[PDB]
């Protein structure tokens, strides 16, 4: 519409070991025209960078510490972003954002310059229950 | 692999006193590709500034940034009441990494 607006979706108390889909539905842009992330938060502590997928949607990285476990996606024909979290542990309790970065085009490797955040979802809190 | 790290951990101020935030890089960081950010309680986070100095759109003159290299700052000349809250600085010249935040609250 008018305001841009993330609205992240998915969140809940889950169990270790299980998998989990979040997702995150954009309006007022075209998601599919940037690069597109989801940042954490957990309880008391700072924000953590979690995945990118760039504008292509044909490359995407991802912290170490969730590497192997996580997979972002984009559904370009509902303007919707998605990360698909298997192997869930207790370190990944957290609020996850969606954020756009205006400035990131391309991405060869995982060390190169990236993007900053320009707008923000409210959040979906993933809890994984002991 | 860039570790940012943040100073101090809390400062406790008064409305109308200036706070000024460190962040230090363990590489430098290229381009002086350094953004903040500012995050009230429950909130997400709201961009303040980046390329370490270039304020985004509708954020009022009293936040500035700068630096450069390994050692950035964010300087709020004078506190107003909405601006108590927690402060992140993330660096983007090698991949994305954050500081842990500095939170700026009410001096009691």
């Known amino acids: 519409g008018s305001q841009v607006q993330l609205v992240e979706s998915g969140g809940g108390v889950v169990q270790p070991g299980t998998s989990l889909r979040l997702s995150c539905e954009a309006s007022?842009?075209?998601?599919?025209?940037?690069?597109m992330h989801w940042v954490r938060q957990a309880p008391g502590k700072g924000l953590e960078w979690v995945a990118v997928?760039?504008?292509?949607?044909?490359?995407?990285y991802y912290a170490d510490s969730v590497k192997g476990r996580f997979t972002i996606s984009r559904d370009i024909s509902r303007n919707t972003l998605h990360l698909h979290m298997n192997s869930l542990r207790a370190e990944d309790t957290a609020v996850y954002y969606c954020?756009?970065?205006?400035?990131?085009?391309?991405?060869?490797?995982?060390?190169?310059?990236?993007?900053?955040?320009?707008?923000w979802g409210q959040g979906t809190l993933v809890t994984v229950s002991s | 692999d860039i570790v940012m790290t943040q100073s101090p951990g809390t400062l406790s101020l008064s409305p109308g006193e200036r706070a000024t935030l460190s962040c230090r890089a363990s590489?430098?960081?290229?381009?002086?590709?350094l953004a903040w950010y500012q995050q009230k309680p429950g909130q997400a986070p709201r961009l303040l500034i980046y390329?370490?100095?270039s304020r985004a759109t509708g954020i009022p003159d009293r936040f500035s940034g700068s630096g450069s290299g390994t050692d950035f700052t964010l300087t709020i000349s004078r506190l107003e009441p909405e601006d108590f809250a927690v402060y992140y600085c993330?660096?983007?010249?090698?991949?994305?990494?954050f500081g842990q935040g500095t939170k700026v609250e009410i001096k009691r």
């Open positions: 997928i760039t504008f292509d949607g044909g490359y995407q």
């Open positions: 954020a756009r970065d205006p400035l990131t085009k391309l991405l060869p490797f995982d060390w190169v310059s990236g993007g900053y955040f320009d707008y």
């Open positions: 993330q660096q983007y010249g090698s991949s994305f990494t």
């Open positions: 590489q430098s960081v290229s381009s002086s590709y």
């Open positions: 007022g842009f075209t998601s599919s025209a940037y690069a």
């Open positions: 390329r370490a100095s």
